[PDB]
Amino acid sequence: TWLSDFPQAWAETGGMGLAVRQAPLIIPLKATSTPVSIKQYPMSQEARLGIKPHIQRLLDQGILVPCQSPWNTPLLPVKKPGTNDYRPVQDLREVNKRVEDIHPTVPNPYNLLSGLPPSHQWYTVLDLKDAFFCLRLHPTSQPLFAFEWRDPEMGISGQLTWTRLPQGFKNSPTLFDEALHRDLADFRIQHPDLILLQYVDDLLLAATSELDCQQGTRALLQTLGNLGYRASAKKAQICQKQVKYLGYLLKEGQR
Amino acid sequence: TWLSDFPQAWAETGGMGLAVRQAPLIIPLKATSTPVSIKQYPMSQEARLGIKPHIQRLLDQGILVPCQSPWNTPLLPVKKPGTNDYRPVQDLREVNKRVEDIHPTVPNPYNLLSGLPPSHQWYTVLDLKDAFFCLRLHPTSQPLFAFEWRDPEMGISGQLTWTRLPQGFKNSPTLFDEALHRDLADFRIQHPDLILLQYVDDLLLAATSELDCQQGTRALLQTLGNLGYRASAKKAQICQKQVKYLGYLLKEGQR
DNA sequence: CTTGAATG
DNA sequence: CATTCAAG
DNA sequence: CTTGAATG
DNA sequence: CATTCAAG
Ligand SMILES: N=C(N)c1ccc(Oc2ccc(-c3nc4cc(C(=N)N)ccc4[nH]3)cc2)cc1
Numbered sequence: 001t002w003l004s005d006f007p008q009a010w011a012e013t014g015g016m017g018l019a020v021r022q023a024p025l026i027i028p029l030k031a032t033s034t035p036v037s038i039k040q041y042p043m044s045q046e047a048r049l050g051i052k053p054h055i056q057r058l059l060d061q062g063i064l065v066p067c068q069s070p071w072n073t074p075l076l077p078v079k080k081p082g083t084n085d086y087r088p089v090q091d092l093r094e095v096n097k098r099v100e101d102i103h104p105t106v107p108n109p110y111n112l113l114s115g116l117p118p119s120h121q122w123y124t125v126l127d128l129k130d131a132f133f134c135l136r137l138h139p140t141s142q143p144l145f146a147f148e149w150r151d152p153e154m155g156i157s158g159q160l161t162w163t164r165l166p167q168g169f170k171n172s173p174t175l176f177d178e179a180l181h182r183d184l185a186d187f188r189i190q191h192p193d194l195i196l197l198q199y200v201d202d203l204l205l206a207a208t209s210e211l212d213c214q215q216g217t218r219a220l221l222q223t224l225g226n227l228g229y230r231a232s233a234k235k236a237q238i239c240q241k242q243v244k245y246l247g248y249l250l251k252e253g254q255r
Numbered sequence: 256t257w258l259s260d261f262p263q264a265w266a267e268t269g270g271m272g273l274a275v276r277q278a279p280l281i282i283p284l285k286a287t288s289t290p291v292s293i294k295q296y297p298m299s300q301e302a303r304l305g306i307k308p309h310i311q312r313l314l315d316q317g318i319l320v321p322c323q324s325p326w327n328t329p330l331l332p333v334k335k336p337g338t339n340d341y342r343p344v345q346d347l348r349e350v351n352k353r354v355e356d357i358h359p360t361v362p363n364p365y366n367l368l369s370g371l372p373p374s375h376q377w378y379t380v381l382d383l384k385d386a387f388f389c390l391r392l393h394p395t396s397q398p399l400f401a402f403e404w405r406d407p408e409m410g411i412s413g414q415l416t417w418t419r420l421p422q423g424f425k426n427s428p429t430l431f432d433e434a435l436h437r438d439l440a441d442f443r444i445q446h447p448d449l450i451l452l453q454y455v456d457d458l459l460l461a462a463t464s465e466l467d468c469q470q471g472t473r474a475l476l477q478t479l480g481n482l483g484y485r486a487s488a489k490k491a492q493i494c495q496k497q498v499k500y501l502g503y504l505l506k507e508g509q510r
Numbered sequence: 511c512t513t514g515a516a517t518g
Numbered sequence: 519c520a521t522t523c524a525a526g
Numbered sequence: 527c528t529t530g531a532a533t534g
Numbered sequence: 535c536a537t538t539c540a541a542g
Pocket residue numbers: 514515516517518520521522523524535
């Protein structure tokens with residue numbers, strides 16, 4: 001009943017996250033960058049109706065807010081199964097090109113897994129839901145990610161932008177990984193015997209026994225919830241001898 | 256009047272050459288080679304009539320002879336200006352593939368020219384006419400180069416082959432260059448002060464003065480004629496301060 | 511004419 | 519993968 | 527829909 | 535140089 005013991009740590013019961021200890025992120029531009037405003041290609045009504053619910057939800061959550069900005073990038077309608085199930089995908093390539101590069105600090109899965117001792121075979125895998133959205137963007141950097149939004153007949157003035165780290169931004173994975181490392185530094189210190197692997201929003205906790213794993217998981221969930229992050233209860237793999245992590249199947253200490 | 260003083264050395268007056276000091280060449284095949292007989296693609300009457308005179312001339316010269324061989328490669332009709340001026344071109348690629356490779360001993364023009372001292376600025380350039388044809392092919396190797404020949408209505412039985420080193424054969428340049436080097440070895444020894452460069456059928460004689468060049472040229476022409484080779488009187492550049500050799504313009508010792 | 515390599 | 523070039 | 531890279 | 539893939 002981990003779902004009930006840690007209501008705040010799960011996406012299904014704690015609501016949208018917000019990393020309260022992390023200062024709003026400022027995104028430095030390259031020395032010669034000037035705003036670029038790309039025209040929004042006309043979107044069919046089908047695509048707009050498919051996207052609308054997502055946009056409204058983000059607006060209600062305060063993740064998207066109205067704005068007037070010199071920057072503008074196109075929104076794209078992306079589906080998968082049939083001509084249904086849409087979801088907003090912003091093409092931030094022209095923005096990415098104008099943002100100063102940062103060093104890629106996220107380890108590749110292969111090297112990350114090398115830090116898992118055979119002594120720790122009790123695993124717990126958690127994936128953080130809407131991880132990037134948990135990190136606030138400083139108001140000065142918000143205008144950079146603006147896009148146009150029109151309702152199938154009459155909607156908001158013109159542009160909308162993100163108040164949190166957006167999908168499609170080249171530095172989101174690295175900035176998120178670095179932010180969570182800062183937030184989980186104390187947890188690591190308070191649990192010397194535990195092994196914690198972080199790959200952006202995918203976490204692997206390893207303990208020597210089933211007890212230390214349940215104790216560790218309880219503490220990690222409590223810490224994450226308190227910090228403002230949210231894990232997927234649905235996909236969560238708690239205290240298992242075998243788990244799926246980063247495309248690998250961890251079993252008998254293999255891999 | 257070099258044309259009259261050396262009748263035997265010029266192609267225009269000495270007739271078709273024949274390297275009398277060189278033993279008929281035997282062409283070794285690769286260890287696993289077996290004869291290949293490629294069908295002759297039908298040739299238009301236009302092409303056949305264009306080729307016929309050349310074939311008859313070679314037959315009269317004994318350069319081509321009738322034969323029955325397990326080997327056969329295609330003859331091609333090649334023209335240049337208009338739909339006129341034809342000339343037989345044999346595709347010996349399938350034969351080349353089955354012949355043992357030999358080391359490429361012909362120097363590249365750049366390196367060959369490095370052996371020309373500034374002290375020798377009186378040049379003479381001669382190109383040997385139908386050079387390969389001057390080298391006999393041993394009867395055992397003649398069948399290898401056979402091709403089919405049909406007259407525009409009624410001609411020779413079937414196949415014809417070469418009795419001399421043929422054009423299109425991968426080793427002809429090297430074998431010719433090596434043969435002429437053997438034949439001109441004594442000339443080099445008898446004329447220590449002369450510079451002689453050989454690039455297959457293109458010869459460059461260099462002397463310190465105009466006299467040594469005329470003396471040297473006279474001796475070279477006499478030697479070549481006696482050996483059975485023939486130079487082009489038309490293209491000959493005798494005792495000049497400036498000459499064209501291997502695409503270069505030799506002048507003032509430059510190049 | 512058929513082959514291979516070099517370009518679009 | 520379709521054309522162009524080069525070559526025998 | 528637009529971009530670049532990878533394939534034919 | 536025309537298609538296909540991948541991605542934002
Ligand atoms: N698809 C198309 N419309 C086109 C595709 C390619 C085009 O141009 C060219 C095609 C081929 C060459 C070219 N091909 C070769 C082959 C060589 C060899 N291997 N002997 C040696 C040198 C050489 N140059 C040069 C230019 C023109 C049009």
